[PDB]
């Protein structure tokens, strides 16, 4: 089951944080579905698992990212021996979708974070904020700041040629 | 004229950077008008000047901020002896206006930045980006990130009671 699964209302249409999650996988179990949500970025924090999309089978580990986009038919399953933990951010909006088309990550939907990547700290920080989300303390502003930082970081580290 | 006056298109309606500017005042000169723009925050980087609004006359210096909001009848004039330089960010959107109403700044429209304030480096950084604005290098994402940071910093340092 899920250590964290915060679902937010879809009140913004340029940029919206839809949900933030942490899941420790159960060995040999996962998910097989057509993605309904706009976009969901997963960061693998430990263990191993497999991501299956368009006939390709990726063996992923700590440091790896995979992104689910609306309409993708996907399967992602924790390793029997050493099941992954992943953090995820679900997001949407017209700006979000324009910025995703500026990164090479949306071609294969998988990447590996370099040693000094800014992406892991942003995703971990959004999940931390989500645990005690308080809009009256302006956590809503902070999550949006962090989502703009995340998409900037994806384009910096995984650019499409100009 | 102005050291910098970058005007942006109004493409976003939840959160939008309208313009960024730097102006070195000429002694005893400035502006007297009804504000048409949504919101414009000014940060005084050098010198002295006066801000007149709603019968009150404020003598401002380095560290001070004043905010122009749509419909305010205002006058702001550089000191005869030591004329101010100010940096300004013009912004708009439904989210921007909701966040401004979580700050105590929007009644008097004047404040002083504390020694450790995060506000000065955000405003200076937005103006620096504006000098060589390149959307193809995703400067548009970075300006929006910085505007969310600015509004978060205003609420943190100038909160309305909860
Ligand atoms: O959205 C990311 C999360 O997705 C969860 O899987 C859900 C599946 C089956 O329960 O059905 C959806 O609701 C379809 O939208 C999915 O969100 C995973 O269990 C999470 O681990 C996480 O990947
Ligand atoms: O918006 C902030 C800037 O305002 C400029 O003043 C302009 C006056 C000119 O009388 O008319 C407007 O266009 C009406 O919206 C103003 O923007 C100042 O010259 C700048 O220094 C800056 O404060």
mmCIF file of N, CA and C and ligand atoms in Angstrom, chain B residues 2 5 7 19 23 31-37 40 42 66 68 76 86 88 90, ligand 2:
data_model
loop_
_atom_site.group_PDB
_atom_site.id
_atom_site.type_symbol
_atom_site.label_atom_id
_atom_site.label_comp_id
_atom_site.label_asym_id
_atom_site.label_seq_id
_atom_site.Cartn_x
_atom_site.Cartn_y
_atom_site.Cartn_z
ATOM 1 N N UNK B 2 14.951 54.572 -19.313
ATOM 2 C CA UNK B 2 15.117 53.537 -18.266
ATOM 3 C C UNK B 2 16.311 52.664 -18.651
ATOM 4 N N UNK B 5 13.442 48.213 -19.287
ATOM 5 C CA UNK B 5 11.959 48.188 -19.279
ATOM 6 C C UNK B 5 11.487 47.084 -20.226
ATOM 7 N N UNK B 7 8.752 44.623 -21.339
ATOM 8 C CA UNK B 7 7.288 44.357 -21.270
ATOM 9 C C UNK B 7 7.051 42.970 -21.873
ATOM 10 N N UNK B 19 6.031 42.716 -16.611
ATOM 11 C CA UNK B 19 7.212 43.538 -16.985
ATOM 12 C C UNK B 19 8.197 43.541 -15.822
ATOM 13 N N UNK B 23 15.088 51.747 -13.049
ATOM 14 C CA UNK B 23 15.106 53.197 -13.368
ATOM 15 C C UNK B 23 15.971 53.957 -12.360
ATOM 16 N N UNK B 31 6.607 60.718 -11.323
ATOM 17 C CA UNK B 31 5.365 60.293 -12.001
ATOM 18 C C UNK B 31 4.208 60.568 -11.063
ATOM 19 N N UNK B 32 3.075 60.924 -11.659
ATOM 20 C CA UNK B 32 1.813 61.260 -10.984
ATOM 21 C C UNK B 32 0.714 60.737 -11.906
ATOM 22 N N UNK B 33 0.036 59.652 -11.539
ATOM 23 C CA UNK B 33 -0.976 59.018 -12.421
ATOM 24 C C UNK B 33 -1.833 58.071 -11.589
ATOM 25 N N UNK B 34 -2.978 57.708 -12.153
ATOM 26 C CA UNK B 34 -3.827 56.589 -11.688
ATOM 27 C C UNK B 34 -3.269 55.288 -12.288
ATOM 28 N N UNK B 35 -2.949 54.329 -11.430
ATOM 29 C CA UNK B 35 -2.365 53.020 -11.835
ATOM 30 C C UNK B 35 -3.409 52.252 -12.674
ATOM 31 N N UNK B 36 -3.019 51.869 -13.891
ATOM 32 C CA UNK B 36 -3.786 51.029 -14.846
ATOM 33 C C UNK B 36 -3.355 49.562 -14.732
ATOM 34 N N UNK B 37 -2.081 49.289 -14.432
ATOM 35 C CA UNK B 37 -1.521 47.914 -14.371
ATOM 36 C C UNK B 37 -2.051 47.203 -13.124
ATOM 37 N N UNK B 40 2.437 46.306 -9.326
ATOM 38 C CA UNK B 40 3.853 46.589 -9.631
ATOM 39 C C UNK B 40 4.592 46.821 -8.317
ATOM 40 N N UNK B 42 8.015 47.713 -6.398
ATOM 41 C CA UNK B 42 9.260 48.498 -6.552
ATOM 42 C C UNK B 42 10.144 48.231 -5.342
ATOM 43 N N UNK B 66 7.566 49.723 -2.302
ATOM 44 C CA UNK B 66 6.217 50.301 -2.449
ATOM 45 C C UNK B 66 5.544 49.506 -3.549
ATOM 46 N N UNK B 68 2.267 49.382 -6.344
ATOM 47 C CA UNK B 68 1.199 50.066 -7.100
ATOM 48 C C UNK B 68 0.168 49.002 -7.438
ATOM 49 N N UNK B 76 5.278 59.406 -7.238
ATOM 50 C CA UNK B 76 6.586 58.953 -6.714
ATOM 51 C C UNK B 76 7.666 59.723 -7.452
ATOM 52 N N UNK B 86 15.415 52.359 -8.475
ATOM 53 C CA UNK B 86 14.511 51.261 -8.076
ATOM 54 C C UNK B 86 14.433 50.222 -9.205
ATOM 55 N N UNK B 88 11.711 47.149 -10.538
ATOM 56 C CA UNK B 88 10.277 46.833 -10.377
ATOM 57 C C UNK B 88 9.898 45.578 -11.152
ATOM 58 N N UNK B 90 6.263 43.984 -12.505
ATOM 59 C CA UNK B 90 4.818 44.057 -12.795
ATOM 60 C C UNK B 90 4.274 42.651 -13.006
HETATM 61 O O1 LIG C 2 4.619 50.287 -14.047
HETATM 62 C C1 LIG C 2 5.790 50.766 -13.304
HETATM 63 C C2 LIG C 2 6.551 51.850 -14.052
HETATM 64 O O2 LIG C 2 5.628 52.957 -14.226
HETATM 65 C C3 LIG C 2 6.132 53.929 -15.130
HETATM 66 O O3 LIG C 2 5.199 54.973 -15.315
HETATM 67 C C4 LIG C 2 4.272 54.803 -16.379
HETATM 68 C C5 LIG C 2 3.378 56.033 -16.504
HETATM 69 C C6 LIG C 2 3.982 57.225 -17.205
HETATM 70 O O4 LIG C 2 3.393 58.419 -16.702
HETATM 71 O O5 LIG C 2 2.222 55.548 -17.228
HETATM 72 C C7 LIG C 2 2.120 54.130 -17.115
HETATM 73 O O6 LIG C 2 2.401 53.511 -18.340
HETATM 74 C C8 LIG C 2 0.689 53.790 -16.738
HETATM 75 O O7 LIG C 2 0.486 52.396 -16.513
HETATM 76 C C9 LIG C 2 3.209 53.740 -16.081
HETATM 77 O O8 LIG C 2 3.685 52.409 -16.150
HETATM 78 C C10 LIG C 2 7.414 54.551 -14.582
HETATM 79 O O9 LIG C 2 7.949 55.411 -15.585
HETATM 80 C C11 LIG C 2 8.437 53.476 -14.189
HETATM 81 O O10 LIG C 2 9.492 54.112 -13.480
HETATM 82 C C12 LIG C 2 7.818 52.379 -13.343
HETATM 83 O O11 LIG C 2 7.512 52.915 -12.055
#
